[PDB]
């Protein structure tokens, strides 16, 4: 059981960010990794015991402090877009046998002008499919957001659902050419027709978007693209 914080954080080029790791376990080895598509897991720093610090393979721009045997911190006194990644803590009592945290996803921005929140809409089932497959299917769509830092979940009558849910692994880009292009994402939720037929059943798609912090300076007449939850709804219907 290794826990690390923060779980999600957005910052800008030149910012300062500190990642925390606590292992209540008695592991004397702690680790910091960064996972990327196209490069897998690369070690940054590690430590052997409280106070010890040892170098990894790509510690550039990174610093670490081992305050206690249980606490291990990753220090980014200077932020750069190259360090935008997904970060993992680890602890070990035995050689090579590691226990990992839940990951911290970092977003380092070039400019805050390129930022947009997602707009969410939900699309209701067909008399066609229900007639056909005696079942119903919903689609929640997230569009036009930069950067890609979101979490979708379906909520049916106050419950987060994991069954019957299919969501994209990676969102796409809206203009892959521009490279400052926004992203889009989609998700599906499939139920028995009966369940949709009830006007009492309330279906929801909520998308968390991690963006600007409350104090952050906004130099636009535009709606501050702040960290928020955008959601869309649909009610069942008998007909």
């Amino acid at each position: 059981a290794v826990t690390q914080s923060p779980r999600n954080k957005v910052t800008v080029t030149g910012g300062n960010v500190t990642l925390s790791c606590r292992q209540t376990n008695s592991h004397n080895y702690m680790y910091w990794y960064r996972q990327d598509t196209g490069h897998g897991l690369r070690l940054i720093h590690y430590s052997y015991g409280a106070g010890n610090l040892q170098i990894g393979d790509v510690p550039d721009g990174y610093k670490a402090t081992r305050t206690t045997q249980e606490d291990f911190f990753l220090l980014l006194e200077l932020a750069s877009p190259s360090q935008t990644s997904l970060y993992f803590c680890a602890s070990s009592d035995a050689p090579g046998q590691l226990y990992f945290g839940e990951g911290s996803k970092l977003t380092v921005l070039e400019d805050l002008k390129n930022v947009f929140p997602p707009e969410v809409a939900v699309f209701e089932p067909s008399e066609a499919e229900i007639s056909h497959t005696q079942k119903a299917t919903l689609v929640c769509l997230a569009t036009g957001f930069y950067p890609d830092h979101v979490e979708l979940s379906w909520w049916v009558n106050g419950k987060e659902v994991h069954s019957g849910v299919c969501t994209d692994p990676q969102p796409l880009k809206e203009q892959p050419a521009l490279n400052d292009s926004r992203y889009a994402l989609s998700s599906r939720l499939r139920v028995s027709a009966t369940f949709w037929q009830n006007p009492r059943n309330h279906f929801r798609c909520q998308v968390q978007f991690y963006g600007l912090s409350e104090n952050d300076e906004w130099t636009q007449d535009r709606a501050k693209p702040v960290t928020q939850i955008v959601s869309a709804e649909a009610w069942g219907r008998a007909d």
Partner: peptide
Amino acid sequence: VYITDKCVLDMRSMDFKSNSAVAW
């Protein structure tokens, strides 16, 4: 036009799986 590759969904209530693809 936009299109997403197949997405497998499963209904554990009835042990039923299904792929899914969307265009728009």
